Amino acid sequence: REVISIHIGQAGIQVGNACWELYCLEHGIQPDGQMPSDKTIGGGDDAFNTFFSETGAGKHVPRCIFLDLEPTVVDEVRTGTYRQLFHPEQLISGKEDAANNFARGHYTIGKEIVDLALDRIRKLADNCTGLQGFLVFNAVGGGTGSGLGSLLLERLSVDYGKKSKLGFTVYPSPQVSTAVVEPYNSVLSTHSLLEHTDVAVMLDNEAIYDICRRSLDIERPTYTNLNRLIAQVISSLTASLRFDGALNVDITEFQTNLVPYPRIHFMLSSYAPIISAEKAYHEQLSVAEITNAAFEPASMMVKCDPRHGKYMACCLMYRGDVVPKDVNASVATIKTKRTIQFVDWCPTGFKCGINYQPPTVVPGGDLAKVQRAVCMISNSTAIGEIFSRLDHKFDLMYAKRAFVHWYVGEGMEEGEFSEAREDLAALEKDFEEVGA
Amino acid sequence: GRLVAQVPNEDPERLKRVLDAKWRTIGVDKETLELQAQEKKDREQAEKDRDE
Amino acid sequence: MREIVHIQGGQCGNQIGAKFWEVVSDEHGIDPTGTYHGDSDLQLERINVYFNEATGGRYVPRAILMDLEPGTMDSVRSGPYGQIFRPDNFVFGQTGAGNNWAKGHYTEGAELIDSVLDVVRKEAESCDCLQGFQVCHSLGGGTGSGMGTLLISKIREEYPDRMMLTFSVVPSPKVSDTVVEPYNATLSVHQLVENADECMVLDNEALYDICFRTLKLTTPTFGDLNHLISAVMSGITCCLRFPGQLNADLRKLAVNLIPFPRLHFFMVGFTPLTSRGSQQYRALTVPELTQQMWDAKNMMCAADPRHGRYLTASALFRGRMSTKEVDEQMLNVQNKNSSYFVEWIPNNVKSSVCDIPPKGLKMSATFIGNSTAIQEMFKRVSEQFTAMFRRKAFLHWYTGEGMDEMEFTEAESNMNDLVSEYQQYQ
Amino acid sequence: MREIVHIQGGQCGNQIGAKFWEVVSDEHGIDPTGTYHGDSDLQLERINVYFNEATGGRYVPRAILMDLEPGTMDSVRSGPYGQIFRPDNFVFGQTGAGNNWAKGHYTEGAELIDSVLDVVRKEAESCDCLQGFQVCHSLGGGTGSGMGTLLISKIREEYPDRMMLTFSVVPSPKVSDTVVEPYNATLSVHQLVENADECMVLDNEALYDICFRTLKLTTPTFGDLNHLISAVMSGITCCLRFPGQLNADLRKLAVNLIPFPRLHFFMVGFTPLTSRGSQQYRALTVPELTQQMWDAKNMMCAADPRHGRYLTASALFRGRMSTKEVDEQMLNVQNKNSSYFVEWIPNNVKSSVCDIPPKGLKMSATFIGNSTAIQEMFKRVSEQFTAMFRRKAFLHWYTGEGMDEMEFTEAESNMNDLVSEYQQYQDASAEEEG
Amino acid sequence: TTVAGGKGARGEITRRPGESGNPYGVSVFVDEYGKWGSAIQGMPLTETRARMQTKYFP
Amino acid sequence: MLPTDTMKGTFAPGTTKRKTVNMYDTQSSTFQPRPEGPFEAEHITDQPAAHEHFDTTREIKLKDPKGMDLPATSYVEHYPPKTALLPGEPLELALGG
Amino acid sequence: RTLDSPCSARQVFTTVHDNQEQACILILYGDDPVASNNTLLGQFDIVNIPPAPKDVPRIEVTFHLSRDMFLTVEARDLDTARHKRWLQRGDIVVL
């Protein structure tokens, strides 16, 4: 069982730098490539086979490719602590960035980076044997993430097609933002994210700021803390592949159990207990309260309100000291409560998964050693709300034709602006009828 | 072989390697790799010294 | 002489079978290293029914494990009584179905079923005279339900005259793991009504209920539910494995419980099940066994038989017991609650006695009562299948896999007329 | 009394023969340096079938090596049990044909085969009553295939009445070494259908499949493949070398397995083959022998016998076994799986038993089935041959030597008529005549 | 005893000659190689790279 | 239990040049047997003393390469020398006259 | 005799008496099948063979002859892994 993770964009590489730090610490690998000298061969070793291969003797090179167009962040990786972890080639770097420009990133520079990337991926899959799927990390706001990210997914779906491609994307927040052309970028990325990623999970940054302000009570969080708990979520939904559990859930179950229609793969995520080193000692953590804690909008990874929505389905990953009894009792209380409502198509709107290994801790992290945890991935109509919120302010700027000359200069036209806008309208109609 | 045959068909050292399935799959001589990396670095430093 | 070939399908099937082989090996005294260490000679004379003598007192089970994911097999060979199986019998796929009946019935079975049939054919022609095959599987998952039904179909076409048991766990709405539970359960039962000889219905909701009320545990892990279903399977097959004053094999119980070839879904109840705190404050007498066996809360299904009519029933007793009290208690329970028993069938109770009790007990029982309350649960499943299929939820995960919608219409129509004929005979 | 002379051709043939002589010398108890040191007197009484007493317990094999490059010969010499072969029997050239059947049949054979024939004659009249010649070679190379087949032809013209076995591995498209494999194999089979008395078809694809699934070895090298083939040959000729309750000579097996003079390509198998970790779990009875012997995954050819009909079958057994069990097992197999056996021949199973097992076991079995599933492999070769001969590819390497295109036309004709004969005999009716 | 279910924690069957966790050593049979979590059980892994060609296996 | 432990045989050099020099040349390396060499333990001065030391309680035979013992042939096993059972005492009736 | 200069040859031997302590290896040079007729060059013995039945324990005797005819003899008791090396005209080394 092997799964390779590709990162596209300056946010992709930063998220990857948090994920792989956590993975090496979870499997006891030192940052310089190999395990400690004192490590003794024992049962439960080889657990790292699904992310690292073993080169030569005592060297573990991950199954990943960072790729960006500006050489800055890639050179930061090449000079950081993990110089010797990643193989030199796996970090694909361009010469000049797309600079917040879907067009420049999709037609100008992607056309020369995509062949080198997919030639690298093919010999990563050829080294692999039991490939579960690819998983992509990107922010749709930028140019490298959106533009050639779409181009990569296009040619990935052409090369393999049937294989699952988990997309953990980062949408821009409604009110807090860092860009101006990002609505054009997000829409032109989505039109390709519809028919290509098999599963797509949304991650907004304001929602995580809210969490780190309220729960972890960090008043001044940088991107590292955000990257930290995002990697926590990725680790929590891959632990079923890695370590043995009582009832575990694979990658290939999400498509089966959370995608009721082949064009609806957009899933809110959440996590609990996102807790600090002092509150954790004071408060007793049990399965029922954290199953409740993973359901308010005050603990979700997307700034949307599912109270305005209807839960299409739900997947619950449990880590730690969890027995199937109480998780079953907890989902019983949720299902019988009426502060949230399930859709009519699903009376059995849940899917639980249980794993034994507790989630690990990191030096420099803010979460303490916790006994049990929950990672939820549900599906609702609140996403059909957030796409309309984004669409309205895309039409705002497109009505006065602001910034349009940039993309036309790169070589595009108005046709794909119109069709991307219409595709968002169609998907809006798609979400409002399914929610009926 | 079809042309020349120096080695036995049951030679112990050859058999010990081929039988070690890990050595067949991945094989390294880490000492020589270290020495050759240092050799490369020393040649680069010699070039830079000549230019200086 | 008469043989039983065991077949496990799916992840829940493998864990069920691991515990089943654990208690049966303990019953016959064979140690986890695989050698005989019993004391009574009676244990040695009837192990051809489940084992094969290998070498120097080495007995390997007559089982076939079947699934699509290696972690189940690793979990099989990790725990105790894991190194007693033969590795050839671990017939085993490599891709994984994952809650997909269509993958479990059209795409992966095409390349797996040839090897399973080769193994099971080898396991059948090894012994002389088969009594019947045995199948443990799940009705929620994909590789258990889909591959299980395809195996049942292929087997019943190949070996028609041989008997066949099927222990199926049907998902309950209160205890709902997956989302595609109706789409799998309905399609599987459709195949199950026409190919399986008889089936015994389990569900985890009733198992948690029993471990809650009777056994009084804080943490009922899956091992204990596996322990309950194991004690059931052992109780079914005790009559073959040990002499008794009144014997009843699989075929004998089948003919005495199945009056119509489509009414072969039974509910189960096991007794005694008492908490170890209350283990000493109780007597051990056959009224004490029948008060708990005929108790409606002790059934291992989510179908209260008090909402229907006990069509037929059977009781298998273990331990050197008094046939007179055995028969007299059955007579009394039959005559008192005379409304719960059908009219046009007098003497609705089959009974049997096998004088060898399970280890650690002196007297026990096993109940297999064919009621008409089982159509309650089938309706409970069928209405959810209708609630989804009415406007095609999740449908493409099967439609693009080779299926047509007519398979779903067939599945619901056969669900429909089955619950109708059960309602008729009520 | 009854004598078997051994002729090894080419590199693959030579390595196979080396392992075979190793296993036979081990079975008869002679040390690698060639002197007898065994225990039982049953070892002495029947080594005249393979050896000659030289001087004080010195026994030299009755073999003839034949190839074209000293690499193979010195690999034979450097191996253990390598000092037993007589150097006058190292008849040998030094140019090399190099995967060219025309070179092995027209240029170099044309002058080496006379010396090879001198040596084989000498070693054949060195004995009293020849049972047969036993030729081990391949069908892909040139020095083994071409020279070996020319030798077969010349021998069949010289000594027509004696038996002739040919152990021939065939090229398979899954594991295919060279590129001219069909060009060689087609002409070789054309010669074998007209000269050889019987041919036993092996192939490295099925050998590898066996070593992967049944043995579950990690590194199945050519030594293990050769060990399998050697055990097969030893199981073939155990009946001549050791006393049994039911004997079966080579001519006896041939007359019991060949219904028509052209249908003599057999698929072979061996039993038992189990892993060292899985041998603890298995039962050890005659049923456990036959259930693995008749298994499709145990045949040593890339032709599933489930895809056709068994014309005839034969089972040789080694070890002290109860003939009642043997016969009732054969009866059960023939009665139950009844459609795989041809109709117009009742009792399609010839069986025999011997009381001396191969080393390491107490009891074992060897299977020789003359099935009609071999036309699968023959068509699988003929289609590649005709695909290439449709445009005279690679053809100059033969044309510029003395061969013509008519030779290839004749090869195709004989191969296709052979598979047609096989198909007609497979689908022939039960009872009617004209 | 509660048995871990489903996949994860690669065991005696998925273990094979060539992978990323299996230790160095001479092994002729795959089922023999397949139980090093049973055979070795707690050596330091410097010793496995030290004794490259040695049995120390079932 | 490695296969190299059971591996018996006598290896030879493979391909090489022609000899071109006979053993009578002083530069041609030759194997000289005498002096006697490094004997082990006390009192082994003479070859016959070596033989007595070898015969007392040390001794070695080469191991049977076959793992099992050779099974007795069915003929010999089925037909061993046998002795007929004793008849028993016969009754004699006195004739009457 | 007549084997080329670089040449190695190994055989496996065992004790014949049950419960034997030592095993005395003698190196003889000659052609006669009787042993007392051949000349003797060097003898040593493997000591402390563990008690065992008739033919169980394994001793490996391997002769190696080098290019300028130096001969070495390695005797290796497999069970206790006792190695003793004998060099022509030079002391016996243990290992």
Ligand SMILES: Nc1nc2c(ncn2[C@@H]2O[C@H](COP(=O)(O)OP(=O)(O)OP(=O)(O)O)[C@@H](O)[C@H]2O)c(=O)[nH]1
């Ligand atoms: N959640 C999260 N988002 C990030 C992080 N770093 C950057 N982003 C997001 O990245 C988006 C812009 O893309 P960038 O990654 O900055 O740059 P890019 O993806 O390479 O696109 P270009 O600058 O045009 O090359 C913004 O919306 C940021 O919110 C991070 O560490 N965590």
Ligand SMILES: Nc1nc2c(ncn2[C@@H]2O[C@H](COP(=O)(O)OP(=O)(O)O)[C@@H](O)[C@H]2O)c(=O)[nH]1
């Ligand atoms: N009694 C019992 N039930 C189980 C076990 N594992 C899963 N289940 C139930 O069976 C259903 C899932 O079966 P599943 O694992 O998907 O079977 P598979 O994937 O086809 O092999 C759920 O309703 C679970 O509640 C088990 O070990 N024991």
Ligand SMILES: Nc1nc2c(ncn2[C@@H]2O[C@H](COP(=O)(O)OP(=O)(O)O)[C@@H](O)[C@H]2O)c(=O)[nH]1
């Ligand atoms: N079983 C076995 N097959 C071999 C060996 N060497 C080569 N082969 C097979 O022989 C075929 C080629 O025959 P080739 O060696 O050219 O025959 P030759 O050159 O005429 O002696 C290839 O398909 C190999 O797979 C060996 O040592 N053992």
Ligand SMILES: [Mg+2]
């Ligand atoms: Mg950027």
